[PDB]
């Protein structure tokens, strides 16, 4: 059923368990060890099975203390090489077997990012972190790579003594390596079944702070004390999640703040949530962002898309829940605020892709397509748009939350397609079918472009933003004096961010306009990364030279691509700062993430 996997489908055999034993070598950049897969045959007379491998060197395959025979098919592009394992004895229905595979990862493996010490905070020890999503788990260990298969797993990781290993799991024990006194062994147990793309690993110099009963925050000695402050409210958000979707079933929720070099956004990995450093503003104003990954534990980690075509099932419901979390934090019209923002992001994604492009469909077809090339915000905000539309159509947020609960409770720890979700939607709402039959299903699910209808959003918190932004865009030299510092009296940090987003939408402003904006609003003082980003772009595109240093510092102070790359783009496009931005790139590129380096360097034409 899954077009992105070469392994045996879940209809033949299913992996129920993974016991991982491995060691981390930072000199060779390799994970060497053994992956022991418990396989349950779903049919009689099963003599062989296939697994996904990508750039893996296979030593041997042991079944019941004896080496079996295997063959590695040819690599197909991003899909990798299939691995055929010949079973010694035929398997009956439900007969279970344990296949142990001795494997070593490649240094160029796409699932594992190795960071040099200069690319970390401490500038002393190296770093390692995994990105499995979507299909990259096959580049770590042989497995069935597909969300349609869920498995519990236990792992034992050997790392240099001075470092620490975390995974997505409950930490069990720590013991000095029996055969290597210079190394340590860390143990992990994941009791809840998960797809293999939620297996995560981090190895580096890490400390911890306990910010809640079940919550530790992990990071390097530089960042732990700040993250402990910013994220102190995560326990209350967790309790909100339990209020909406019921008790937390994964048993521990930790947080790992990646080095400042981390280019991407947060990851939902179970029991350990990755956090981007850009979220530390010092005021806790961006902490609510975390509410996304939290909701993943209640929606989409429990109920998983059966194939990646169905990815919307995962994120969409997740988003729907997260905006309810924020809904109770800042109020309802704020939930509407982030809703309208999400619709805006959908607009930009569609017009950038084009309204005819297949990747704008809610259920895509990934057959020959790389899952990471087609990735966009469509399955997030279009899915949320559908569920919000059905919320307002089916009688309200309370009712549709009831639906959400029934959905999770029914499909928890399983995988489903879109048709399954729609079947259960008609089953739950069966009194209301008359309404449901007026939805256009072919258009919403399978048709590109924007959805055929739009939900009704509350405009107040947005209308303030547009009011001020327009005031500045329409301002004339005579007007600039009337502006006062009180204009921000009622606005949130989120509203200020939207204000600078709308004001930046409109292209350069008279230099004196933004110089005044700095005088009254003192935007230079706020360290919030979103607002500071849009503010510094507003300054640089407006030909203000005083912002050159600031725009530069931020560009190299954080590694997030959504920030770094546009800042270097503008600093290059500004003819006054171009040279300086080039040589600054040449200066800091060694400490940049390897991807952001060549990417910003190609943008700078080096």
> Among the candidate windows 309-317, 527-535, 568-576, 581-589, which touches Zn ion by CB under 5 A?
309-317
Question: Which residue, 36 or 364, is less far from Zn ion as judged by CB?
Answer: 364
- Dist. CA 468–CA 495, nearest whole Å: 10
Whole-number minimum distance, CB 78 to Zn ion, in Å?
A: 21
Q: Strand, coil or helix: what is 132?
A: coil
Say which residues have a Cβ less than 8 Å from residue 583's Cβ, sequence separation at least 6: none
Question: Which residue, 148 or 273, is less far from Zn ion as judged by CB?
Answer: 273
Question: Which residue, 171 or 317, is less far from Zn ion as judged by CB?
Answer: 317
Whole-number minimum distance, CB 146 to Zn ion, in Å?
A: 18
Which run of H or of E encompasses 397? helix 397-411
Whole-number minimum distance, CB 237 to Zn ion, in Å?
A: 16
> Among the candidate windows 145-153, 308-316, 367-375, 504-512, which touches Zn ion by CB under 5 A?
308-316
Question: Which residue, 188 or 380, is less far from Zn ion as judged by CB?
Answer: 380
> Are 258 and 276 spatial neighbours (Cβ–Cβ below 8 Å)?
yes
Contacts with Zn ion by CB under 5 A: the residue count is 1
Whole-number minimum distance, CB 323 to Zn ion, in Å?
A: 13
- Dist. CA 551–CA 577, nearest whole Å: 10
**CB-side neighbour CA atoms (13 Å) of 68:** 22
Neighbour count for residue 27 (Cβ, 10 Å):
6
> Are 407 and 303 spatial neighbours (Cβ–Cβ below 8 Å)?
yes
Question: Which residue, 70 or 250, is less far from Zn ion as judged by CB?
Answer: 250
Question: Which residue, 375 or 403, is less far from Zn ion as judged by CB?
Answer: 375
Question: Which residue, 220 or 315, is less far from Zn ion as judged by CB?
Answer: 315
Instruction: Determine which one of 127, 320, 380, 407 is catalytic.
Output: 380
Question: Which residue, 271 or 571, is less far from Zn ion as judged by CB?
Answer: 271
CA dihedral 152, 153, 154, 159 (to 10 degrees): -150
Within 237-276, which residues bind Zn ion (CB under 5 A)?
Answer: none
Per the annotation, the verdict on 293 as an active-site residue is: yes
Closest CA to 113 of 216, 31, 194: 31
The tokens describing 294, both together, are 């939290």
Within 534-593, which residues bind Zn ion (CB under 5 A)?
Answer: none
From the centroid of its chain, how far is CA 472? Answer: 35
Instruction: Determine which one of 100, 268, 293, 530 is catalytic.
Output: 293
Applying CB under 5 A, which of residues 315, 322, 530, 570 lies at the interface with Zn ion? 315
- Dist. CA 219–CA 208, nearest whole Å: 7
The tokens describing 192, both together, are 């809840």
> Among the candidate windows 246-254, 312-320, 404-412, 520-528, which touches Zn ion by CB under 5 A?
312-320
Say which residues have a Cβ less than 8 Å from residue 489's Cβ, sequence separation at least 6: none
Exposed e or buried b for every residue in 510-520, given b needs 16+ CB within 10 A?
eeebbebbbee
- Dist. CA 474–CA 468, nearest whole Å: 10
- Dist. CA 237–CA 501, nearest whole Å: 27
Within 320-349, which residues bind Zn ion (CB under 5 A)?
Answer: none
Whole-number minimum distance, CB 309 to Zn ion, in Å?
A: 17
Whole-number minimum distance, CB 110 to Zn ion, in Å?
A: 20
Whole-number minimum distance, CB 115 to Zn ion, in Å?
A: 24
> Among the candidate windows 94-102, 125-133, 231-239, 310-318, which touches Zn ion by CB under 5 A?
310-318
Whole-number minimum distance, CB 133 to Zn ion, in Å?
A: 9
Which run of H or of E encompasses 317? helix 312-330
Radius of gyration (Cα) for the chain, nearest Å? 25
Q: Give me the DSSP letters along 18-83.
A: EEEEEEEETTTTEEEEEEEEEEEESSSSEEEEEEEESS-EEEEEEETTEE--EEEPPPBGGGBEEE
Query: Minimal CB distance to Zn ion: which residue?
Result: 315
Query: Which residue numbers are catalytic?
Result: 293, 380
Residues interacting with Zn ion, by CB under 5 A?
315
């Amino acid at each position: 059923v899954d077009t992105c996997s070469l392994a045996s489908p879940a209809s033949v055999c299913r992996t129920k368990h993974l016991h991982l034993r491995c060691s981390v070598d930072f000199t060779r950049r390799t994970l060497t060890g053994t992956a022991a897969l418990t396989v349950q045959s779903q049919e009689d007379n099963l003599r062989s099975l296939v697994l996904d491998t990508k750039d893996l060197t296979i030593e041997k395959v042991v079944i019941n203390g004896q080496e079996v025979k295997y063959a590695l098919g040819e690599r197909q592009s991003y899909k990798g090489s299939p691995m055929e394992i010949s079973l010694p004895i035929a398997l009956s229905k439900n007969q279970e077997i344990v296949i142990e595979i001795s494997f070593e990862t490649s240094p160029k493996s796409s699932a594992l990012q190795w960071l040099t010490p200069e690319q970390t905070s401490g500038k002393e020890h190296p770093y390692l972190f995994s990105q499995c999503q979507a299909i990259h788990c096959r580049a770590i260990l042989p497995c069935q790579d597909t969300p349609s298969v869920k498995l519990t797993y236990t792992a034992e990781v050997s790392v240099p003594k001075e470092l620490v290993a975390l995974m997505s799991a409950i930490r069990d024990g720590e013991t000095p390596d029996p055969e290597d006194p210079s190394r340590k062994i860390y143990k992990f147990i994941q009791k809840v079944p998960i797809p293999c793309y939620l297996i995560a690993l981090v190895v580096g110099a890490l400390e911890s702070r306990q910010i809640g009963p079940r919550t530790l925050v992990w990071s390097e000695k530089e960042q732990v004390e700040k993250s402990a402050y910013e994220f102190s409210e995560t326990e209350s958000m967790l309790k909100i999640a339990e209020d909406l979707g019921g008790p937390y079933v994964w048993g521990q929720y930790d947080l790992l703040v990646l080095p400042p070099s981390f280019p991407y956004g947060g990851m939902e990995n179970p029991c350990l949530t990755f956090v981007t450093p850009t979220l530390l503003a010092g005021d806790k104003s961006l902490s609510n962002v975390i509410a996304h990954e939290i909701s993943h534990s209640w929606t989409g980690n429990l109920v998983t898309n059966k194939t990646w075509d169905h990815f919307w099932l995962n994120e969409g419901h997740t988003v729907y829940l997260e905006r309810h979390i924020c809904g109770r934090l800042f109020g309802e019209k704020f939930r509407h605020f982030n809703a309208l923002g999400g619709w805006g992001e959908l607009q930009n994604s569609v017009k950038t892709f084009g309204e005819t492009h297949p990747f704008t469909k809610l259920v895509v077809d990934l057959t020959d397509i790389d899952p990471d090339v087609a990735y966009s915000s469509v399955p997030y905000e279009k899915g949320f748009a559908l569920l919000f539309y059905l919320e307002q159509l089916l009688g309200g947020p309370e009712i549709f939350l009831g639906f959400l609960k029934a959905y999770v409770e029914k499909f928890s720890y399983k995988s489903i397609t879109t048709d399954d979700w729609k079947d259960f939607l008609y089953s739950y709402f069966k009194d209301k079918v008359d309404v449901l039959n007026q939805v256009d299903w072919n258009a919403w699910l399978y048709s590109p472009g924007l959805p055929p209808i739009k939900p009704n959003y509350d405009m107040t918190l947005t209308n303030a933003c547009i009011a001020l932004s327009q005031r500045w865009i329409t301002a004339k030299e005579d007007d600039l004096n009337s502006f006062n510092a009180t204009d921000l009296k009622d606005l949130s940090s989120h509203q200020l961010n939207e204000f600078l987003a709308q004001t930046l939408q409109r292209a350069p402003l008279p230099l004196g306009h933004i110089k005044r904006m700095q005088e009254v609003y003192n935007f230079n003082a706020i360290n919030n990364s979103e607002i500071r980003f849009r503010w510094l772009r507003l300054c640089i595109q407006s030909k203000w030279e005083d912002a050159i240093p600031l725009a530069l510092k931020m560009a190299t102070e954080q590694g997030a691509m959504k920030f770094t790359r546009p800042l270097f783009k503008d600093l290059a496009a500004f003819d006054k700062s171009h040279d300086q931005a080039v040589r600054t790139y040449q200066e800091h590129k060694a400490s940049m993430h390897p991807v952001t380096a060549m990417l910003v360097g190609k943008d700078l034409k080096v």
